[PDB]
Amino acid sequence: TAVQHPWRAKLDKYRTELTKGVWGYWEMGAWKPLGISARRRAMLRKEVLTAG
Amino acid sequence: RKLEVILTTGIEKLGKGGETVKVAPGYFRNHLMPKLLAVPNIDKYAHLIREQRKMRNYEEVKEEVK
Amino acid sequence: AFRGKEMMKKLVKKVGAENITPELKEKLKACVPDTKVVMGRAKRGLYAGRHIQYGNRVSEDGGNKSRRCWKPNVQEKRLFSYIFDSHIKVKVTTHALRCIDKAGGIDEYLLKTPYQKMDTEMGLYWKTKVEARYAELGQMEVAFFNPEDEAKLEQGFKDLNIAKKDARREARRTFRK
Amino acid sequence: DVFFSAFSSPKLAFASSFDFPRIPVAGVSTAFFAPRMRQKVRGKSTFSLYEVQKWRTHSIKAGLSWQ
Amino acid sequence: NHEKLEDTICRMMDNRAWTTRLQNSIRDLVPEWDHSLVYNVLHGAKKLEHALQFFRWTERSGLIRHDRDTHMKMIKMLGEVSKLNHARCILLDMPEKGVPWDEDMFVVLIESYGKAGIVQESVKIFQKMKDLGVERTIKSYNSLFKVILRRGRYMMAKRYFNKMVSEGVEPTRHTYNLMLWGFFLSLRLETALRFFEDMKTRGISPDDATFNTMINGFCRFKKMDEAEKLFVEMKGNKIGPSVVSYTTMIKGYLAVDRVDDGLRIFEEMRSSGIEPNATTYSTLLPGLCDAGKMVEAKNILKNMMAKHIAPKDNSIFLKLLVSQSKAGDMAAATEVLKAMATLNVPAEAGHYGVLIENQCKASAYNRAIKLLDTLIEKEIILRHQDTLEMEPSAYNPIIEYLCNNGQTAKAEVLFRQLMKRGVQDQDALNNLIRGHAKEGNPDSSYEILKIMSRRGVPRESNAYELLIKSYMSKGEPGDAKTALDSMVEDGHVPDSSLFRSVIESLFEDGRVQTASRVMMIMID
RNA sequence: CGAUCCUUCCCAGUAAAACGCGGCGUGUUCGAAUUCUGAUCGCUUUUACGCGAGAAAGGGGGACCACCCUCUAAGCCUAAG
RNA sequence: GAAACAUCUAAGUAGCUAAAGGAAGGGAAAUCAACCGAGACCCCGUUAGUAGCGGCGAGCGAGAGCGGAUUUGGGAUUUGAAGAAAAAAAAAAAAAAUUUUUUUUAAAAAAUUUUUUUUUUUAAAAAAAAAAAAAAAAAAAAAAAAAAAAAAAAAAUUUUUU
Ligand SMILES: [K+]
Ligand SMILES: [K+]
Ligand SMILES: [K+]
Ligand SMILES: [Mg+2]
Ligand SMILES: [Mg+2]
Ligand SMILES: [Mg+2]
Ligand SMILES: [Mg+2]
Ligand SMILES: [Mg+2]
Ligand SMILES: [Mg+2]
Ligand SMILES: [Mg+2]
Ligand SMILES: [Mg+2]
Ligand SMILES: [Mg+2]
C-alpha cells in the first residue's frame, strides 16, 4: 500500500518548506532559495491535484 | 585600483603602525611585501598584527606612562 | 579532452589502486581538474584558465578573412611567499596576477583556490606543498620577553660573539704557526 | 593524505632549508622570540641562549622556481 | 543592563551557519577565555550540534584547555541524546590531555549505553573499569543494577551482588530497592523474599519506596487483599503515606474486578494529603469506563481542569466518550468537547463524529446540526496532523436526513470536504442526488453524477430517473434529453412510459428534432 | 571489534559592460546586487534580543522602460532508448 | 558553384595531432510558452524547404508544439525543537432566547535463553552458585561450508578435534 501514494513522503518532507514561498523566502535579511526546485514542486503539485 | 594594507612600522607619508592604508598594487607587491613593511588586509594577518602589537605595546605603554 | 581521466590514471598508478576505497575514488574524481588545456606552455605556468584563441582577421573594405590568433598576456615575474620567506619565479598572466592581488598573495591564492581550479599537475603539487607547510605552522607558538631579558640576552649574545671571534682568530694563528 | 603521498619524496621542516618565516613575528620585529611546538600538557618556561632568536636589523635570500 | 555572553554566542550559533567568518566574530567578541564562559555557553546551547561544535573548536583552536567539569558536562548531554560513539571517543582522549579519569564520567556512560538497550556494553565497561584503574565502589554498582534489571537480568544480578558483597561492600536501601523491583518484575517471589531477609539481617529500616516495591509486586501478582494487608502494615510501621502507594492501590483494585474501590480509596485520599497528581487521574478513568459508572466520571472530569491536570495517555478521552455516550447521558458531553479544546489538545474528526452519531441516533437532530456546523467551520477534517478520521456512520445517516428532510447545500459542502481527505462512498452520493433533485436544483444532481463519472463511482439506473423528471417538472425538456443521453451512454435503458413522457414534452415545446432523435434510439 | 559524525571546498575577480573574433564561447581591460550579533518602527517588559508590522535579491520572455509571468547561474551523481 | 571574381559556397568537409571508454557525450531548468499552460537528457517522423540568414544573388536553413522509442530519479534536505501581563477552565450568583457579567482557584511504563555442579519434592517441577549468549546497527578481514564412517595430531591403540 506504500506504492498507492508514493508522493506522500515528499509532501510531508516539504510541507513546512512549501508554505514559505514559491521559489524562495527572506531569512535574516537575505533572500534564500527554496529547498525544492520549481519543476519538482510542479510535479508534486500535479500528483497531489490528480487525486482531489 | 588601490589595495588595503596594514602598516607594521612607521612610513613617513603613509602613517603610523597598526593602521590600514591604501597603496598602489605595484608599490605593495614590489616594495612593502618583500621587506615586511606591510601585510595584506585579510583577517588572519590583521588579527596577528593586532595581538602582537598589543603584547609589545603593553610593555611600551607600561614604560612610557609611568 | 579527458584530462581528468588521464591524470587520475597517473595518480592511481602512483598511489596504488588497492589503497583507495570506492568512496575515496568518488571523492578523488571531484578534485582532479577536468579543464581544457592543450598548449604546452600553459602546463608550466600559472595562467588561471587563460588559453590561446584562433580566429579571423577581417579587412575593412573587402571583408577578406585570414587566420590569426589571440595570446594571453603572459609575464615572467617573481612573487614573494610568506612561508618560504623567498621569491618564486613564475610565468603568470595578468589575470592571475590580479586574482593574486584579490586573494592576498601567492600563498593565500594557493590555499583559497580549490583543487579542480588549479588546472595543472604542478598547481596541485604547489597547493599540496603550501598546505602541508601551513599545517606544520599551525601547531607552533612563540614566546616574547621582557626588556630586562632583552638586555640580558643581548649581552649574552655579545659575549658569545666576541669569544667566538677570539677563539677563531687564535685557531687561525696557531694553524698558521 | 592521497595528495601528500602522490607528491611526497621517493623515500620539523621549519629549519635547515628555509628556517622560520619572518611573518610569524610581524607585529613587532625587534623582539627576541622563542618558537616552540604547542604541547597538550602545559610546557616549561626554561629558555637557554641557544633557543632564543632575533632577526637583527640586517634582515628587515635565494629564489625557487615554479617548474 | 545589557546582554550576557552565553546567550549572545548561542544566538550566533542558532541563527548563522558554522563557518570560519562566524568563528572570527566569536573570537573577536570573546574578551577573555575561561571555563565559566565555556560552561555557560555549553549549558545554554540550543542544539547538541552547536554545543559539540563549540567544544571541539575551543580545544582545537588553542584558545583554552578544558577541564573535568566541562568534559563531564559534554558527556552528560551527549549520552542523554545518545551519541554513544561521540561520548566514548571524547572520554578515551583525556589522559593524553592530562586531566584524570573519574567514575562520574563512566557511570553516565553506563546509563547512556543502557538507555539505548546496549546494556551488554555497559557490563563490558563495568568489567574493565577496575582494569583501567578507577575506583568502583558504590554508585557504579548501583547504576549497573539499575540498568541490567531494567532489561531483567535477575540471574546475572544475583552473581554481581555476590561480587558486590564479596569485595568489602556494604549495600544499602537503594541497592536493595533497585534489585527487589527487578526481582519482582522477573517473577521471582522466593528471590524477592530471600533478598528481603537479606536486608533484614543487614539491619536497615525500610522506607516508603521500599514498601512501594512489595505492593507493586503484589499488584503484578494480582493479590490485592494481601497488598491491603501490606498497606496497613506500612501504617503500623510508622512511615508516611505516599501518593505513589495510593496510586498503585487504585491500580491493583482496578486490575481485575474492583472498580468502585478506586473511589473508595479516593475517599481516604484526603488523609494522605496530595490528592491531585497526574497518575491517579490517568489510571482511574479506564477502569470505570470499562465498568460503566458515570457520575464518578463527570465530576472528576470537571475537576481535571479545575486544577489544570492532564493524563499520561490521551486515548482515555476517547474511551470515556464512547462509554458515556453508550451510557446515555448526552448533556454532559458538551463538557467533554470543551475539555478537549481547552487543555492543550486540538479536537479531532472522530471525536466530533462520535457525538454527532449519538445526537443523530437519538432524536437530537438540531443539536447534531449544531455540532456539524461547529465541526465544518473549524476545518477539522482538512487537518493533516490529526490521526482519527470521521467514521462512515458519522456522515452516512446525517447526509440522508439533511437531503431528505431539508437543505442539501451544507450536506454537499461537508461531503465535498470529505472527498478532499478520504471518502468516496456511493450511499451519500445517491442521497445527495435525490436531495438535490427533490429540493429544486437538478443542476447539482447532474454535476454530482459528473463527479461520479470522473471518479469512477458506479452509477445506478434509478438516479437518472429522478433527474429526468426534475428537469421535466421545471420545463426544460432539452435538459431532460441531455440527461437521457447521459443515461444511455452510461448504459441504462429506461422504460416506454418515460419515453412517452419525454417525447410528448419535447413535441409540445416545438422541439421536433430532439423528439425525432429520441425516436431514433427507441427504434434502435 | 563495536551503534560509526569529526570535513576538497572559505565559494565574486563571478554575472554584466567596451573593443576584436566566433558554433551564446573566447583574447585584452574592467567590474555589481539583499544579512554577516540583520537593520527600522511600535509595545509592554517599565528598562529583553521578547512580540507584532512594513519594505528589502537576481536571470529571462528579439534594442529599451514599466507591469505581469516563469526560473534560481558562478561544477553534485545518475540506468535505458 | 556563383555561367568571370573578391563577401559567400564547397565546409568545420578532406587531412594532421592528442586523450578516454566499451560505448563516449548529454542530463533532472537562472528551460519553453503566453495570462491558458508544459515539465531532465539522447534518437526516429511531421511542422517545412516554412520563419530566418544572404554581393537579400547563388545558396545556407531552425526552435517550440504534436506523434513514437526509453520511461527514473537520487543528494544536500529538514527537526522532535527530547519532559507583573495575556489566553482558558472549575464553584457560586444574576439575565435573555446555549449565550453575557462579577466574585475565589529512584516506583505509580521498562520481558530472555542455553550449559555445568549440588539440593528439595512427586522421569515430572523447582532451590542455590558458575560460564555465557538475545552485539554482525555498519563494513572489511580471517577460518570454516549438512548425516554416518576411514586416516593425522593431542590426551588416557582408544576418545576428542581436524
Ligand atoms: K553517463
Ligand atoms: K564556369
Ligand atoms: K577564371
Ligand atoms: Mg529581454
Ligand atoms: Mg519583449
Ligand atoms: Mg565559378
Ligand atoms: Mg561553413
Ligand atoms: Mg575529420
Ligand atoms: Mg577498450
Ligand atoms: Mg553511459
Ligand atoms: Mg502559473
Ligand atoms: Mg513528446
UniProtKB/Swiss-Prot annotation, chain D:
**Quaternary form?**
Component of the mitochondrial ribosome large subunit.
Q: What else is known?
A: A stretch of 270 kb of the mitochondrial genome is duplicated within the centromere of chromosome 2 resulting in the duplication of the gene. The expression of this duplicated gene (At2g07715) is not demonstrated.
Q: Which family does it belong to?
A: Belongs to the universal ribosomal protein uL2 family.
The gene it comes from is RPL2-N
* Covered residues, full protein: 165 to 246 of 349
Tell where it localizes: Mitochondrion
Protein known as: Large ribosomal subunit protein uL2mz, N-terminal part
Organism field: Arabidopsis thaliana (Mouse-ear cress)
